[PDB]
Design an enzyme around this catalytic site. Structure first.
Site, PDB file in Angstrom:
ATOM      1  N   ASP A  72       0.819  -1.216   0.000  1.00  0.00           N
ATOM      2  CA  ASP A  72       0.000   0.000   0.000  1.00  0.00           C
ATOM      3  C   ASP A  72       0.854   1.268   0.000  1.00  0.00           C
ATOM      4  OD1 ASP A  72      -2.381   1.525   0.046  1.00  0.00           O
ATOM      5  OD2 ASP A  72      -2.403   1.568   2.239  1.00  0.00           O
ATOM      6  N   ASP A  98     -11.185  -1.889   1.269  1.00  0.00           N
ATOM      7  CA  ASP A  98     -11.166  -1.435  -0.121  1.00  0.00           C
ATOM      8  C   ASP A  98     -12.401  -1.913  -0.883  1.00  0.00           C
ATOM      9  OD1 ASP A  98      -8.492  -1.144   0.952  1.00  0.00           O
ATOM     10  OD2 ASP A  98      -7.780  -0.852  -1.102  1.00  0.00           O
ATOM     11  N   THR A 134      -4.080   4.928  -4.245  1.00  0.00           N
ATOM     12  CA  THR A 134      -3.112   5.806  -3.586  1.00  0.00           C
ATOM     13  C   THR A 134      -1.754   5.761  -4.279  1.00  0.00           C
ATOM     14  OG1 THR A 134      -2.639   4.052  -1.962  1.00  0.00           O
ATOM     15  CG2 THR A 134      -4.200   5.772  -1.304  1.00  0.00           C
ATOM     16  N   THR A 135      -1.423   4.598  -4.837  1.00  0.00           N
ATOM     17  CA  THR A 135      -0.181   4.402  -5.582  1.00  0.00           C
ATOM     18  C   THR A 135      -0.230   5.136  -6.926  1.00  0.00           C
ATOM     19  OG1 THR A 135       0.049   2.200  -4.561  1.00  0.00           O
ATOM     20  CG2 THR A 135       1.469   2.684  -6.448  1.00  0.00           C
TER      21      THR A 135
END
Ligand SMILES: Nc1ncnc2c1ncn2[C@@H]1O[C@H](COP(=O)(O)OP(=O)(O)OP(O)(O)=S)[C@@H](O)[C@H]1O
Ligand SMILES: Nc1ncnc2c1ncn2[C@@H]1O[C@H](COP(=O)(O)OP(=O)(O)OP(O)(O)=S)[C@@H](O)[C@H]1O
Ligand SMILES: Nc1ncnc2c1ncn2[C@@H]1O[C@H](COP(=O)(O)OP(=O)(O)OP(O)(O)=S)[C@@H](O)[C@H]1O
Lengths: 487, 484, 487, 62
Positions: A50, A354, A83-84
């Protein structure tokens, strides 16, 4: 005094600092992605893929790098997943910008095209987005399945995705938003992963205060007391017990300690009680059953009591715990996430986090887009032809904005093993004229496949937020020419 | 002992120190200007474009550089907007000066021409300034719109400028100055920016017995404590406040429990332990005097507010001291999403209030976007032609230094600073336009009067006089004595 | 032990030290002179052009340099204006001396000519000095105007010089010296520079203690109380107020606090009172009106009361202050020097200090001389022809003494911008035979003009003191051949 | 400016006039060159660069 860089030495200092932390999380992206191990000052070990959890807890000290950790922090806050992707795009937008800066194309002409392209990217994503009727359960299962996939193919099992959709569709307050706080998450052990059940109750890690009290109660009106039911040796609790009986509450959850005299009297009435329940579990019981936490025994009301569907002290996995659970029409749902070891449970807990978000976003919006770097190619070709109708030097900023969109499909091949130069042409040519819009790279198959038929789908908020958060950040960073750093 | 530079080594040391801090704020100028991030000793972070806020809070130690931080400090004190422009001009006046110093032109001949040109520049800006009738609201909206623009185009919305003009025209004490203190600024949250509608003490009432909202309230600001025991020793203290005739009471210290009953028994509302910062706010807004003795509390030491109300705004119950009707005092409820946005929307109004207030007091506005800078530059070069002596070159260098603002506007825009500098200069000759300037969004030279880009005359006149007087003094130094 | 220089190394060490501090104040001289900023150990900043204030508060440690800071210190003590001129001359007398020392002309032959030339310079200045007797107000205005000029042409306004002369002519104790201490200086704010007024008077920064009291009275008797007129709640002030009425004072200045009960009774009588007036202002009121400082109410007299012409609470410059004005024959005068900022006020305060000195010196002496380096050329040519009638090697010392006198007119051109070699010839040729004696350089005009008609005039004491103070110092410094410095 | 002025149909004969500054039609200006000037220059440059991109080892004696 004390630290300053001049013009060209300040612009390059800020761009390099944003790119160097982008390469740190660039390998993590994709099903064939890598993991990162972070060892801090304490010597505490933690391994995570993450992207947001890496940037927050590692030692970062450069002023320009700290400003880019606000993008992923507002990505996990607004969306959760992606987020990546939000960080890597921002790094490529800085790489395509400094190529224009060396050619003496002024930053304000760059910021003029970057904003105009991001303004068009948002209205082009709406047309290519697919509509998934808020209660279209067969597609919602696929959206949930796509969310579990990425963290693990073995985690992605048919039965798991069917459970998640049923929980999210129930907690919808008509009409018609989705509150993520309504779903309670419980982390308990036992040989599971498959024994994970869709639950109606908080699971309190406690027992009954007296063995004289019933082991199971029907349709329990639950009085959540924050105040202490305490005493001496002169039956001063017969009032306190009768005051709970006055409301009509057969089950009593007490946050503080219950005295031994009151234990006998509550057992004589038939009321089940529990002493010293965790404050975290008390807040769960109040929202799940629909109860009010009362900090005074003299004013306990009947309309402050919650309603459960199954309350039972089961000896599940050896430990005897109180099942609350079970509901006809529940606005609050509990998920008993279980696994072999606690470290596995926590990972299966974060995998559901998620999966809850994407289904909740689909109900609120309507809207999904093809994953695996599929919509990234469609938006890239549609903005280059949009750049053609723009006169001036701001066109080159839109061209660099559109050429930067091809970084995600390029990095997906970088971590997969295949050539990032060969496939980048194959998908680009398969988007021209009409079809496909849904053509993307499947890392397991190798060849370019239709992502709609594969089951690789992401919510529109995963892509729209990531672009807007990266664009607004890079626009601000390209507006710095002098750096003042004291101490 | 201890540090000294001799003649040429002292003059160049002072000029370089003034120029180096001028380039720090040179990129901030213009609608497409840059922002600055300042990290001091504490590690506290703040990002700002405003030229005066950068120079004040950053680490500056050179003796010559500290003297130039008095120009912008007196620019925000007198005008407000144009703090960046006042510094950049002063830097160019030092660059054009050292070009004359290397040619052995004496500094006193330079100071002779620099003062004479600045004396003429002030008596040339008076003609090129347009008169704006004090209540010409359609132009006042444009002036307010031009003030909001510069801090952000997204901040500049049609509806916002219409609200500001109505507030300033109401607080005018006929006849006929504008007091900026009459407009109260409130910083509250909530999904707004658009919900912004035409002192806020973070406290409640000392007793629930006391009422909540008066009309035409008299406020007694007490610094002294109203305190006690258990033998009604406050009946004198409460009656002494009643003797003045103040229904509202703001106490900086603690009010005792016995006095709470008696003040509420009369009908007087009190508040205990209000912050010292908020007490100084209440004294200047309502027109009150902070009294540190309960025995000498007078009726003429009390302030006057329009509406005092304990609203539960944004959840928190706070004392709303504002308010009026046919109003000589107006409150602005400036609201936004996050507190950091609110403070910026609060400072954006501060500049918008000033310009409209200056237009009512003066009459006067000049074209912005480096428009009046070209007109004044060409009128001073022809003025230099009628001057005999070596002081002419000082006036020529003074006029050539005026073209720095239109040049720097192109520097941050993206367009060439050498090409446009000729296009506007040729479009000022003979007659027209006087109002011709550079529009950074369009690119081509446009008429600024028709675009709506206008700034008050005080923004230009103060900036020139503050920069000229500073550079005149700096060119009068030949020896530097710095001990320690 | 510990430090010593031998002969030639000691003489050159002392001459260089006197010259290096002379160049520090050499650029300050003239209407187009430069200013100096001094930053000491505390970090306290102050900018000044005045030559004596620079040398006193800056870090000077060389033994030979400290002895030259006694010339300007005795210049501000005796005259006031011309502190810069006294130092520069002393530096040139050392430069013209070491030119003779390198040629092996003995120091005692140098000191023989330097004393003889300074002895003749004093008796030649008396013949070229113009007479303006002690109450010739039209010339006294010009002398005051010449003093204000030099610090600023904008400071030199026609009205200001007329005010100063009236004050100095009044404070003359017949017959017939001028005491500079008799003129009180007050530094107060307000939009002024032009609102600067001549007070035979005190201006008290206070109001009336009660709004019931009168605002304007004629022929007022003022009781200056230092004691407190105080109380309780039982009219214990009716005695104190009546004791004030017993003397016959309608105006009352109290240094301490007046109680609220006494405020009503004094207003009932018609007596105006003021509470807590500064101790500095109380000493002003006692000397101006002719009053006494009084501490213990019980003894109040009519012969301790001062007499003023007009007492009025005017709202001048916004602030409502007590105008105690209009004395008849004042031996003490107060000057309310006012300006916008306090830093401006202090400069306007020091500008009057020089203006008071010159007018006071003109009354005590009788004489003035032409300024702007005019009398410096006349004295220079008259001493060179005086040198011609001297036989021996002492002649060259007189020649070097006369050639050193042309430094002031040379430095006046140096700071002006004009050539210091061209004008030095123009004025020198315009002094030969007869005319002018009053020919000098006007820095604003550029060309050589008659200084008598321009209005550029300075008292004879400014020139006579500066020469004698510089000559006696340089004569002593040329008598040192060995230096002993311990520690 | 020229790249956008070639799209769809027109002009084919749009180019830069260095004296004027703005993009002008080259057919009407009188700025024309034979086809052999362009066709030879491309073929001579292409064949040379194709041969140069086929070298991986260089042997230089003396
Ligand atoms: N089977 C698959 N084939 C191809 N692409 C896939 C597949 N599964 C997921 N993806 C894509 O891989 C990307 C997700 O990779 P991750 O490494 O999980 O990074 P992220 O989702 O951007 O950020 P995290 O998960 O918050 S770390 C998305 O762009 C997906 O559409
Ligand atoms: N639309 C516009 N087109 C051209 N010039 C403009 C426009 N709006 C404002 N200006 C000019 O831009 C200048 C203002 O720029 P800013 O960066 O706000 O600096 P400043 O006003 O000098 O100082 P601040 O605001 O106190 S920081 C003025 O000279 C304006 O006349
Ligand atoms: N208008 C003028 N034209 C020519 N010379 C002038 C004029 N006004 C004053 N002066 C001369 O300038 C000298 C005074 O210069 P200043 O710089 O004030 O120094 P100073 O008086 O020697 O010392 P201060 O004032 O105590 S610092 C005297 O020799 C004057 O006669």
């Amino acid at each position: 005094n004390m630290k300053r860089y001049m013009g060209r030495d300040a612009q390059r200092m800020n761009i390099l600092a944003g790119r160097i932390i982008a390469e740190t999380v660039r390998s993590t992206l994709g099903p064939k992605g890598m993991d990162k191990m972070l060892v801090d000052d304490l010597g505490d070990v933690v391994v995570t893929n993450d992207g947001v959890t890496i940037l927050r807890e590692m030692s970062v000290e450069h002023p320009a790098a700290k400003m880019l950790i606000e993008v992923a922090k507002t990505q996990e806050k607004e969306v959760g997943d992606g987020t990546t992707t939000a960080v890597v795009v921002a790094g490529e937008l800085l790489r395509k910008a400094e190529e224009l800066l060396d050619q003496n194309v002024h930053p304000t002409i760059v910021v003029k095209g970057y904003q105009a392209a991001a303004q068009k990217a948002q209205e082009l994503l709406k047309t290519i987005a697919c509509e998934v009727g808020a209660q279209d359960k067969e597609i919602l299962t696929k959206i949930a399945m796509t969310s579990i996939t990425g963290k693990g193919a073995e985690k992605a099992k048919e039965k798991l995705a069917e459970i998640i959709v049923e929980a999210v569709s129930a907690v919808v307050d008509d009409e018609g938003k989705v509150d993520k706080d309504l779903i309670k998450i419980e982390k308990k052990s036992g040989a599971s992963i498959d024994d994970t059940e869709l639950i109606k109750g908080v699971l309190v890690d406690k027992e009954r205060v007296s063995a004289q009290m019933p082991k199971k109660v029907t349709d329990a009106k639950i009085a959540l007391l924050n105040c202490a039911i305490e005493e001496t040796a002169s039956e001063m609790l017969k009032d306190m017990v009768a005051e709970i009986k006055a409301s009509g509450a057969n089950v009593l959850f007490c946050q503080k300690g219950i005295d031994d005299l009151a234990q006998h009297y509550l057992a004589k009435e038939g009321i089940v009680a529990a002493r010293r329940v965790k404050k975290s579990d008390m807040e769960k019981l109040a929202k799940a059953t629909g109860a009010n936490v009362i900090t005074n025994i003299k004013d306990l009301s009947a309309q402050d009591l919650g309603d459960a569907g199954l309350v039972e002290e089961r000896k599940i996995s050896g430990d005897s715990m109180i099942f609350v659970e079970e509901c006809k029409h529940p606005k609050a749902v509990t998920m008993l996430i279980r696994g072999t070891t606690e470290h596995v449970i926590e990972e299966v807990a974060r995998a559901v986090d998620d999966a809850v978000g994407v289904v909740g976003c689909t109900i609120e919006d309507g809207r999904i887009v093809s994953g695996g770097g599929s919509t990234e190619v469609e938006l890239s070709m549609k903005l280059r032809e949009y750049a053609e109708g723009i006169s001036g030097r701001e066109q080159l900023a839109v061209r660099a904005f559109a050429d930067a969109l091809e970084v995600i499909p390029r990095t997906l091949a970088e971590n997969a093993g295949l050539d990032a130069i060969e496939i980048l042409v194959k998908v680009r040519a398969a988007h021209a004229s009409n079809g496909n819009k849904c053509a993307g790279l499947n890392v397991f198959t190798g060849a370019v496949e239709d992502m709609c038929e594969n089951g690789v789908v992401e919510p529109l908020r995963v892509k729209t937020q990531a672009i807007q958060s990266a664009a607004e950040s890079t626009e601000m960073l390209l507006r710095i020419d002098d750096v003042i750093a004291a101490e």
